[PDB]
C-alpha cells in the first residue's frame, strides 16, 4: 500500500516539474531573441551617429 | 437506467481515463470527486454513470482489469485518477505475452472469478440495469482473451440485457504485433456469437483525422483517445439529458440491426475543424451533415463508396429545428439513392437532444451499418490463412493447450460472416 | 520485473564489467553501492529493482553471478574500483582453466564447480517476487564458456523449467581468429545450445571492429570499446522494463514475436546512431534516418549480409524523443523498399517499442550524446551462412583427427563428434526448408 | 522566432498563439503547473511571517496566554504545522505536523497555552494568586495564534490501531492539528525531568526554562520526535509522534532517551 | 574503469527524460472565444412554456434558438452546495455563522483572553498576496453531538 | 446489572488490557479514573462495569490471575496499569509448564482458594449480579486447567447466573504448542457440562481478516486484540445504552441454545474496511447484512456453506429503521433457504441500539449457532487419537496424577457431541 502511494506521488511531482521546466525554457529562448534584436538596433544607431 | 463499464488492457485503460475525464467535466464533477455543478439538469441523471457516496461525492461504476499494473499506476497517477474506487483495480503478476490462449485459458481463469464478483456486485447494486459497455483492443493479449472471456460469462449471467463493445482493430498499413491475425480472428469469432452491437475503430483513421482535418503537426495518442472519448460519450447522451425526441441503446439496436449477425458498425463525429479556420465558418445543420457523410471523417479504414448502407443513425445535440434535420436526411437519401439498399424504405433514424457538449453550439455522432466492413475481415482472413497453412508460431498456442479445431472454426465463422455481408450487398427484389 | 544476469568465462566477465558500469551510471548508484539523495523530488524510485536489490541500510548490490575457472580476471574485479559493489559470493572462481577444451569444462572440471553456482542462483531466485528470465553472457570459442555454460544451462533447464533464457554469445569471427580449436568448441557448444535456449543473439568481433573504424574515428580499438557497445545494446533492449514509455515490451514478447518454430531462434542484432561527438553536431538525426541506418549491413554487429536471405520477424526498440507517427511513417517507407524482403508466410513482420529515456553518456566513452536511438533484433535465414562455414572448418580438421586425442583423453566418446555434426546438418536443413517460398501456385 | 515558411507553418503559428492566449488568460484550477507553483511560493512566503513574541515574566514562571515555541532535546528543531497537508477523516479534519529549524518566531511555530477545567480527582488546587502559572499534573491545551487562520487549531492524538499509525515510521501514535478542541483528546500534562523527584514536584509551579516531558492525558503516552526525515514544500522535516523511546527494546518500561524531552523558548532579553 | 568522483558528474551523466505535452481538449473542439465560452444549459420546453401573465418574459423562436444562459431551477444544487459548505469544501462558507448548543470547539477563555488582541493591520499585511488561508470547520464536534442522541 | 470479569493466563491478560482500554475510551474515563465525558448517556450506565471509589474515581470490576508474574508485571507496568485495583492481581511462584494436569491438580488447588475469595467478594458486593465473563485460551496450560477449575467452582456456588466464555482455539494450519490436543479435549469436556455459552476464535481467521479485508502489510497482536476487543464490547452494548429493541445476555442465550448441550458459537463483526477505501462507500443496512453473512468476515476456519444455521443473532447499533432490518432478515432467509434449519420458522433474532461506536455511522455484531463447528471438534479428536494410541506424552499427565480412564471418558464425551451435531444437522421434519 505504501509503495503504490509513493509511486503515485513521485509520478505527480515529476510530471509537474517537467511541465514547469519546459515552460521556463521556452520563455528564456524568447527573451534572448528579443535582447539580441534590441542590442543590434542600438549598435547600428551608434555607428551612424 | 444504469450503465456498467468494463476497461480491459492498456488501450482500454488509457481510453477510459479520458472518457471518465470528459464525463466528469460534463456533469461538473471536480477531480476530487465533489459535485460542483450549477444546474439541476446536470445532477438529475448523474446516476446513469455515477454511484453516490456519502456527503456529495460520486464514484464511477467501472471495473479496470489488466495483467501488469503499469497502466493502472499511470491512471491512478493521472489528474482525475483519484475518483476511481481502489477496490476496482484488478491485476495479476505476469503479462499476456501477446498470446490469445494465455489470456483466455491460463492466466484468465485465476482472476476471472474476482472480476465476475466485482461485476456482479455492481450490476446487482443497480435499481434497474441497462446494458454493459466494454472498450478493448482485439490485437492485444489480455484485451482479447480476458475481454472475450468476461463477455461470455456476462452473457451467461445476464442474457436479456444489451452487450455493447468498442474495439480497436489492426490498421491495414502497419502492424504493431506479428501475431495479430490469430488474436483478431479468435476475438471476432467470440464477439459475433456473444455481442449484440460492436463498434470498430482504426488508429490509422484517427491519424488521418488529425493530419487532414485538424492539421496537427505532431499528434499523440492523447488526441486519438480524446476523439474516441468524445464519440463514446456522445452515443449515450440521450439517456441522460432531456430532448425533443428521446432515444435509448435498445431503440438504436432495434432500428440498426436487421438480422442478429449484422451488428458491426462504422462511427463518425462531425464538428472537426482546425483552429485557424474555425473563426471563418459557423455551425449549422447542413455543415454538420456534409461533414457527417464525408469519408474523411469516418473512423474506420473501409470507405462507404465501395459498399451500401443497410442502416444508419444520427444523434443530434443542441437546440435546433426538426425540419432541417428531417429534410437533410431526405435530401441525402434522395440524391445518393444508389448507395442505399432498396428493400428498406427509410434507412436513417434521427434523434434530438437539447444539451450540447460544452463549448459547442451543436454536435452530432453518426453510427453506420455498411457492408464495406467486409473488406477488413477478408484481409484478416487472407493473412490468417497465409500464416496458418505453415502453422506459423502455432506451438505457442498449442503449448498453452488450444485444440487446432478452434482455429478452423474461427476461420469458418469469419468466412461465413463475410459471405453473409456480400450476399445482402448484392440482394435484389426480383 | 526482475532479471538475473549470468556471466561466464573471460569475455563474459569483461563484458559484465562494462554492463554493470553502465547500469550503475544510468540508475545513479555510486561505485561503493550508495545512491545520493534528491532534493527536487520528495521520494526515490523503484527503477533499480530490475537490476539491484537494496539492503536494510540502503546499500545496493547487483543481481548477477560471475563464473570462471581461472582466478586472475575475477581477482582483477575483486581488487579493482567496484570492489565494494559486488557480494563476494557472487564472484565465483576455480583454480585452473579448461585450456580451450570443451571436454575439460563439461566432463572433468565443471562438474565440481557447477553445484556452487546452482546454489547461488537458487539463493538469488528465492529473493525475488516477479523474476521474468535469465540473461546469459559467454563466449563459445573457449573451453570453460562452452562446457560449463552448456552444463549450467542444462541444469537450469531441469530445475526452473519454463522460465526464459536469453543468450548473448560471442562466436568465432569469419576470418579473424585467435585459437586453433575454435571450430570444435563452437560446434559442440551449439549442439547443447540448440535444445536449451529460447533466443540466441549473435556477435562477431570483426563486425564491431569494422563499426568502430568506419563510424567512430578510432584507429586502434581494444576490447573495452567493444564491450561498451555491447553494454549499450543490452541497455537498450532492457530499458523497456525499467522506464516509462508509450509502448512497453516485456521479455516474453520477444519470444512470442521472434520465434516461429522452436529450433529457429538465432537472431541478428544492429544499432543505429554509432557516431562521434564532432560529427554529431553537423547533422540532424531524425527517426527516418536512423531507421534507414539499422538496415544497412555496415550497422550490424554480426558479419552476415541480410540481402542473401529473407526476414521472418523484426523487433524495433526506440528510446528517447520519438513520436509514434514518425515510427509508422518510417516503417511504411522501409516496407516500400525492394531490397528488403520477408518470407511470404510472415505478412505482419514488425513489432515496435517506444521508451522516453534517451541513452546515457559515460565519462570515458567515445559515443556522442544523442536525443534518440533505435535497436533491432531480427530473425533471418542468412544466419545459416555462419554455421555452414564453421561446419566446413570442422570437417577440414576432423577428416584427419587433427586434435581429437585431447578430447578423448579428457573424457569424451568419439561418437559425440558425429552426433553433433549430424545435428548441425539438420539445423542447416531446417533453415533451408523454412526459407522456401510456396508463393507460386501449381 | 519565425523560421522558414515551408510546410504547415501557418496553422502551427495560429495554434501556438491560441495556446498561449489560453494559458495566460484562463485559470484552469489545479491543472496549470505555473499557477500552482506560484501559489506554493506564496504559501511558503505567508507561513514564514515574523511574529511579536512575548518577553519572559518577572516571576520566572511558565504562564498561560503567552506566545511560545516548542523545541525538542534531540532534533533541536521547533514544532511546526503545514495547513495544506490535510485529509478528511471520519473523526474530522487532520492537519499534519512536524518539527523544523527556523530563523526565529513565525506564524507556523508560535503557540499559546490554555488551561483545562478538570483535574485528576486528587488534585490539590492552586491558590488564587497562581491562576496564570502552569503547574505539574495540571491539564492544559496547546493552540495556534489567532492571526494564522479563522478557526483556531489544537494539538490532538488518537489511540493506535489497525487504521491509525504515525506519519513516517508507522510504529507509534499519530499527532496532528485539528479545529477540534475543548475535548478529551486535546489535553496534555507536563512532568518533572528527574525521575526520582517526579512525584515530589507534583502540583508545583513550573520554572520558565525547565526541561520537561509532555504526556497525552487520555492515553498516558509521552510526546516525542524521532530522527525520521520526510520532505515537503519547506524542505526536510522530522517526524512527531507519541511513544516511549528506550535503550533496550526488551524492557519497554524504563529510562527515556533525549527525544522524549522538550523545552519552552522565549524571546531574548 | 576509473570510477566517478563527484556527485555532480554522476548527476550530469543522465540526460533528463523527454516529455510530450498532450494537446488540451479546448484546442481541438472549442469554436467560440477560447477564453470565455458561452454556457448552454437550457431546454426548449423550459424556454417555450413560461408564465406570461405572472410576469416572466416570453421568447421568440429566434430567441429560443439563439439564447445563452443557465436554467433558473437550481434547488438541488443549492442544497448540495450548502451541505458541502458545512462539510468544508464549500466556497461560499455557509457555516461558521453560529454554533450548536452542545458542540463547542474553543474554550471561552481563549475568546476572552488572547483572542481579543488581534492586530488587524498585521493580519491585512500578511494576507496580502495570491494565497489566502483556508477556513476549516469543526465538523468533528458537530458529528460528535449528533452521535450521542436517541 | 453488573458483569464481573476474569482474565487468566498470558492470552487472557493481554486481551483484557486492550478490552479495558476500549471500554475506558467509550465511557470517557481517564486512565487516572477521572470522568471527562461530554454527555450523560456515557455516565448513566457506568455502574455496569465500574465500581465507584471515593471522591470521583472509578475502578474496573476485573480479576487478573496468572501462574508466573511476567505478564502481570508487564501490564501493571504498562500505561493503563494503574487503573487496576492492587488487591486484584493474583499470581503464583511457578509456571503451568504448559500442562493441563499440572495446572488443574497440583499448582491449581494452592491458588484457587484465593481466587475464589476475590471472586466471591466481587460477586457478593453487587446489588444485583448478572452473569460472569471469562477470557482464556484452550491451547495453553493455566488458562485451560485453572480456568475450567474456577468455572466448576462458580457453577457449584452460583448455578442460577450466566457463565459466558471467550476462548482461543488452535489454528488448523500451524501449532503454537505440541500438546494442544490434550489440553483442548479436556477443556472442551469441562465446558460441555459447565458452560452456558462459549465463543471460539481462530488466530488464522484474524490474520485472514487483517490481510484480506483491511490489507495490513505487517499485522501485530495489537490489531488482533483490537478486533477481539471491538466484538466483545459490541455484544454487550445494548446492555448499557438505550435503544428501540433492547436485548440481554440471557435473552440471547434463550433465543440461540435450542437443546442443552449445544452452546458453542461463532462470531463476526461487519464494518471492517481499509482506511483508503472507507471514504468511497457509505453505510447502509444491505451492505452491512451482505458483508455480515459473507464467510470472508467470519472468525472460524469452518465455513457455513458446509453446514446449516440452527439459530442466529444480529445486534445493530445506530438510528435506523426497523422495516429495513426486518425485511433484510426475511430476504436473506428466503433467498438462501437451504442453509437454514427447517423446523424453526425464523432463525434470526434482531436487536437495535441507538449509540454506534465512535466514528462509524452504523455497525452490527453477528452471533451464529452453526453445525459446521462439528468439523473442528472431529479434527481435534483425530489428532488426539493419533497422540493417545502411541502414549506420545502421557507420562507427564500420569505423573501429575490422572487415571487413564479420564482420557477415554473425555474422548467418548466429545465424540458424542460431534454425533449430536451430526444428528441435528441431518434431522428432518417427518
Ligand atoms: N568482444 C569481446 N570478446 C572477447 C573478450 N574476451 C575474450 N573475447 C573473445 O572470446 C574468445 C576467447 O574466449 P575466452 O573467454 O577467453 O575463453 P574462456 O572462457 O576463458 O575459456 P578458457 O580459455 O578455457 O578459460 C576469443 O575469440 C576472444 O577474442 C571481450 O572482452 N570482448
Ligand atoms: N487508439 C489507441 N490505441 C492504443 C492505445 N494504446 C495502445 N494502443 C494500440 O493497441 C495495440 C496494443 O495493444 P495493448 O493494449 O498493449 O494490448 P495488451 O497488452 O493486451 O493490453 C497496438 O495496436 C497499439 O497501437 C491508445 O491509447 N489509443
Ligand atoms: N490473539 C492472541 N492470541 C494470543 C495472544 N497471546 C497468546 N496467544 C495465543 O494463545 C496460545 C498460547 O497460550 P498461552 O496464553 O501462552 O497459555 P498460557 O501459558 O497458559 O498462558 C497461542 O496459540 C498463542 O498464539 C494475544 O495477545 N492475542
Ligand atoms: Mg580463460
- Could you say which structural class the secondary elements and strand pairing of chain B correspond to? alpha/beta
Total beta-strand segments of chain B: 12
Which chains have the largest interface? D-E, 45 and 38 residues
The topology string of helices and strands of chain C comes to EHEEEHEHEHEHEHHEHEHHEHEEHHH
Residue fraction in strands of chain C:
15-25%
Strand residue percentage of chain B: 15-25%
- Percent range for helical residues of chain B? 40-55%
Q: How many angstroms separate the termini of chain C?
A: 50 Å
Order of helices and strands of chain B: EHHEEEHEHHEHEHEHHHEHEHEEHHH
**Which molecules are bound besides the chains?**
guanosine-5'-triphosphate, guanosine-5'-diphosphate, magnesium ion
Give the helix tally of chain B.
Answer: 15
Shape, principal axes of CA atoms of chain B:
globular
The oligomeric state of the chains shown is part of a larger assembly
As laid out across the biggest beta sheet of chain B, the strand order is 5-4-1-6-7-8-9-12-10-11
User: In one word, what is the shape of chain C?
Assistant: globular
Helix/sheet category of chain C: alpha/beta
Q: Please state the CA-atom Rg of chain B, rounded to the nearest Å.
A: 21 Å
Total count of strands of chain C: 13
In which range does the helix fraction of chain C lie? 40-55%
What can you tell me about this protein's structure?
This is part of a larger assembly, with 1 copy of chain A (49 residues), 2 copies of chain B (430 residues), 1 copy of chain C (442 residues), 1 copy of chain D (269 residues) and 1 copy of chain E (150 residues). Chain A is 96% helix and 0% strand. Chain A has 49 residues and is an all-alpha fold. Chain B is built from 15 helices and 12 strands. Chain B has a 10-stranded mixed β-sheet, sandwiched between helices. In chain B, strands 2-3 form a two-stranded antiparallel ribbon. The N and C termini of chain B lie far apart (44 Å). Classes of the chains: A mainly alpha (49), B alpha/beta (430), C alpha/beta (442), D alpha+beta (269), E mainly alpha (150). One guanosine-5'-diphosphate binds next to helix 1, helix 6 and helix 9 of chain F. The PDB classes it as motor protein.
